[PDB]
Subunit: 427 residues, 4 copies
């Protein structure tokens, strides 16, 4: 036998919950003994999840606010970090659209296999690790921490409390820093800005949030748990069993058996308060980018919970200039941070940048061929003064790093890559 | 017992070989009976592989030339077709860098799992199929053919003839139209524009081209087979056993057992000639974008095989404006076309478009937050006159197509997505 | 543009629904035109799905009955067919237990990723195809059909109607012949012999059966659709919306909002009758093997639907000796077949055979080392008289088939595998 | 900003290499600073790989010998440990045959995707972890260590030194304890007991072993590195470049350029000695299970390398009773153990166990239906005396464990699985 990965005792775990300020405003309805009972004889260490979660928590407290863009590939996350961004957002919508394990293009309705997001978390972490390895051998100290924390989409958990548990565990195994969970019926899940949304009862989402925390505790990592409510626009709910939901129930039913419910900020606020003890961050989806509406939500929840941090989705599902002038747009995130919205993210940033940049290049290329590509390459060259490095694509993906591996195994290797390359001679 | 998928007879196959103009200049050193014995009692129909290969072959003869850009995600290929391109190039380098089944970022050295490119082939077809389905329910006739032919990188085959066979079979099952195969040692494979390259003997590559043809024949599809030679810059070869290679052997050997060999256009020309009976297209990697060297290579091959189509890599591994003036860049592809270069491609187009667009957005975002994203969204709106559609990301990704499935199953469904979406109300 | 895989006209499909006996007893609530609307410009052929479904249907009408054993690996399926079986069962329980895409061991509660069963379907077809390729090379006419139809577990569809649709589509792409769908809540799905089952409303299961059929129609293949009811033991239902369900609802609720419902054969019979127009086979999960209960169910259904075929789970979750005697155990399937149970299967056969054989082997090995193994080898030699071939393991996994590919490419290869093998010299 | 996962200093690594008896006679031709240079800013902890490798190294010394059977599924490994076995062997031949990521059935020729064995390593560890978790909840302490060390097949590394590096790294991420590497040309790899084998030069294999050690060092885990030579039967070698290989070169060549070499125990002992400073265990492939040949190989090695442990493949490719008597067969492993073979394993145990046990059942089932199955269920019942537990399949697979998760999350949950089960009532 062995002591490696020996689980902590329940008293040690209790001590930590009582001692670490991380757990100041955090309610667990299960016991430390319950956690240990689920741990077996060996607890795998999850370095990147631990490191990420701790970094993320400090950033939410140390910065004015943390903003992120949705990344759907590893290289996308690398560029975000290279450009000075300090956190990464992993969008389930983007995974459905262009990066899931079925191989298919889907709308955002939880259609893809449930291990799809964990795979992209692991991909993003691998890509940042490579960027980190390359920087080290290059003596590049331009970025202090390549392993920026990742906050990923847990959707509606793909089923019940057990599905939620397995997803959080998978996300942790892959190195996630934070995960979010929404109070929608999993079998009818929608993007927050699609219609046809169905809520589940308040208590059912507390079970989800409890389940997400249990998985993190059993995995012995301080995963940041975010609760999201879709009650601003959802006109349906699965059941009227929960007394907290009954005030918005209208009596009318649909043919499927769903109850109609009165949507808006009011049930969002009540839901936020109920989730607060079980959420590190709280997020309500909205129909418009509106600062007053955000202030309204923020005030009401902080009245009850002064230190409860909030999250906001600066969604590309909004037509921004339709609703806001350049001046409000420019100050949007700053104002939001003043209200307690400490995590802010553009969910579909990667989808749009990728689709637009390839459309633009392919269109020019269709008309003018190489002239069109040369314009991009020249922009890349120009971008180097900003810190862009990917013009030299070979070193960017690690040709220099694997040369070092190769010469470590055999210094006189005849088959190394960078020496004699066009990159060496032309860039 | 059934007659679904029953194998043809050798006689039928032979007739096909004798009379189909597709096979005019194709040498097969195995028998039609050999093919049949490999087919068991059922042959699966590969619709996309068949359709793609037939469309590709006609475009090569119908169009002045077929050009393409490297796609590494499904959405990229969609935007390329939407912008008017008629074929998709699937780059092994890009798969190594940002889209392979290990989840890691790699340089272009055949490090990733051998089913990686096939998986991307299937993804790209899935994505094109989605765009096709959406076009049909939207009444969108702007794109003539959504299922553009995919030409994919078979690298050095990941081993010997059998690994080659299995890779070609997997590409076909995934629906590939064409595949290219290079005369390097698989265990030391490099991007053409990296150094450290090791050639295999001429006959070993003829064996590769034979295996790739054989897999296509057994799968019963007219897959376009592309032969690539890396002799312009490789200074090593695994063996001097082949008399056609001996004139360039120097005599010196490395510690690995590799022979030094004289690189340049001369051994490329000879190899291209030995490969011609086994290749629908021939491609030589070169160190610069140069019409004269292209002309030189084209002239010499055509003098011996007048109907031999060629392929040219318009590589991002070149510093284009360091080597050419804007006038020469503007005419490059049409000039190449005139010489017989019928398939032309920018291998790493995807990697650069993706990396540069995200660096630029993230950089802007870091300084201006929402102002930076809105500039992109506005550029997207502006692009609609050119044919861009992804600004409406919900329908782009099939929300309307799935709503159609939903209402087909249940016309009274209360939970369809687009009705009441912010997309519908703001776009 | 091309003719390959062009979709049929609505008129043509209608013609088939009208005139093909296959659809005699089949209700479709959507139209032929709805099917065409969803097929885009190109319809992929699915040879193995078509062949298997056609073959399965014929067998259901020819043989007294069709039985099968649950297979979780490809070799297992190969051996089942070798041993003379005519169909393969693909258990979701077994996939959860030992063959799903998360890599984890799960209980049967829809915990694993939704593309796990399609991947095993594809695996089993690949394995059978290799067995079929090898036979055609060894001139083995022993087995008449290596491509036995596969019937696969669709569970509760992993969510809503769209999740169901996507599962069926992926099952078909992998070459499934038939699929079964059960009337449970997916977020709380259970093995039928587990407790805590929650039913869905009758109409919701008709929605599922409809979705499964629609995916088959869109994919243009006559997949066998199987309807399963879990009403014998389930005491919970999600809603009281459906009038057909209301007679069993007690009026008592749970804290989650579920409704208590009266379980037993009576609701199973009512549900079966409701599912009948949408199901090629109907299957009632039961708590004990009981020829009497089976006849009761069988007679009640046939009274309304005389030609409705049924299916029966001979479940290892039963203690067979606690309930029955040797004489009846021997007649069991034959008697069921006379009541109209035309498809019969042992769900967990593979789990038990694999787990037991390995335990027995390992146990002996621990105390007796090589003696224990040598014994297994002897039985394998013995079993050769009954048709077993796996003792010559090299040729069993295709060493000779691949040698043939190798010599097809190059007859003079010095790197063939079987020549010089210890299989050639010791066997 | 974090110090979690900060790598050790060169000096600390150096100290471990100097003083820790683990690294006693281990040559590393690279430096401690070379290792650190490759580690980036963060080193991920690999709990199961560290634990397994440490445990395995101890067992190899504390125990008389360590023996193992090839496992190819997770359940298979659980039954091996349950039966008292102390280590698990992961066969590449078995992955090729029935458990690789292409989904196809293959002969043992390195045809499958290179990440296939790592996936089975992860699966096996997951399976053992589940069993550990259940046993802890059931108070079963009959197995002291559920997480038995896993020794895995690295084959010929799927290419060059960098492919070896990545395979070893993936094996470690998955939790491997040891890995073996053979001196064949990957592009022509064969199972040891097939023919058509090709050796690579001695120094090339040293490169392989050095790369495998480097990956383990960079990953900071004491992975057990095993070298295998295939020189006993191989009559071919890629090159005559290595002077240690020249004595066996005959001078004859093939049309492929390979060199004919004299096979036998002679080059095996020479290669064993060359590999010894780079291998924790040495393994020689034999034509027959002969104790005398093993004595001859062993003695020759210990005379120069006294502490060098050895490994032996008790292979099903041998017809065992065709060579040995029941008296020797029974003493075989004990005898080998004396000679210095502390690791012995049956490569294809799982294959034969699986294929036979399922052919047996399916064959009975085809004649006798349910009678055949109950025969099996009766044996499983009979085995609960020896410790067999899979009869109660629900608990075996985690039903009780997930019930505990469910009740921890919500003690009032009315949808738990075991209460009301047939397992709770019939077993
Ligand atoms: Mg989302
Ligand atoms: Mg809180
Ligand atoms: Mg390439
Ligand atoms: Mg099932
Ligand atoms: Mg092996």
């Amino acid at each position: 036998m062995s002591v490696v990965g020996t689980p902590k005792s329940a008293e040690q775990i209790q001590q930590e919950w009582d001692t670490n300020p991380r757990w100041k405003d955090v309610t667990r309805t299960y016991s430390a003994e319950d956690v240990v009972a689920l741990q077996g004889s060996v607890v795998e260490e999850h370095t990147l999840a631990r490191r990420g979660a701790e970094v993320l928590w400090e950033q939410l407290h140390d910065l004015e606010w943390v903003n992120a863009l949705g990344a759907l590939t590893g290289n996308m996350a690398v560029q975000q970090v290279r450009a000075g961004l300090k956190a990464i957002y992993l969008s389930g919508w983007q995974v459905a659209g262009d990066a899931n394990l079925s191989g298919h293009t889907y709308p955002d309705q939880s259609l893809y296999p449930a291990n799809s997001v964990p795979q992209v978390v692991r991909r993003i972490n691998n890509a940042l690790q490579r960027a980190d390895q390359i920087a080290k051998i290059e003596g590049d100290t331009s970025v202090e921490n390549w392993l920026a924390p990742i906050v990923a989409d847990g959707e509606a958990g793909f089923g019940g409390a057990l599905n939620v548990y397995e997803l959080q565990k998978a996300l942790i195994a892959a190195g996630v820093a934070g995960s979010h969970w929404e109070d929608q019926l999993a079998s009818e899940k929608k993007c927050g800005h699609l219609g046809g949304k169905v809520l589940i009862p308040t208590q059912q989402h507390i079970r989800t949030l409890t389940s997400a925390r249990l998985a993190a505790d059993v995995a012995d990592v301080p995963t940041v748990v975010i609760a999201r409510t879709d009650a601003e626009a959802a006109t349906l709910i699965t059941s009227d069993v929960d007394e907290r939901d009954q005030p918005f129930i209208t009596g009318e039913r649909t043919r499927e058996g769903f109850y109609r419910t009165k949507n808006g900020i009011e049930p969002c606020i009540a839901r936020a308060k109920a989730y607060a003890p079980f959420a590190d961050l709280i997020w309500m989806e909205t129909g418009t980018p509106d600062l007053e509406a955000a202030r309204q939500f923020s005030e009401a929840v902080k009245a009850e919970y002064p230190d409860q941090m909030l999250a906001y989705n600066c969604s590309p599902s909004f037509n921004w200039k339709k609703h806001l002038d350049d001046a409000t747009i420019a100050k949007f995130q700053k104002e939001l941070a003043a209200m307690g919205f400490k995590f802010q993210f553009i969910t579909l940033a990667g989808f749009h940048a990728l689709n637009y940049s390839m459309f633009d290049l392919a269109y020019g290329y269709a008309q003018n061929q190489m002239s069109a590509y040369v314009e991009l390459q020249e922009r890349e060259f120009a971008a180097e003064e900003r810190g862009y490095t990917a013009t030299k694509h070979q070193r960017e993906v690690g040709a220099g790093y694997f040369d070092r591996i190769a010469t470590t195994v055999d210094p006189n290797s005849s088959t190394t890559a960078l020496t004699g390359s066009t990159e060496e001679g032309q860039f």
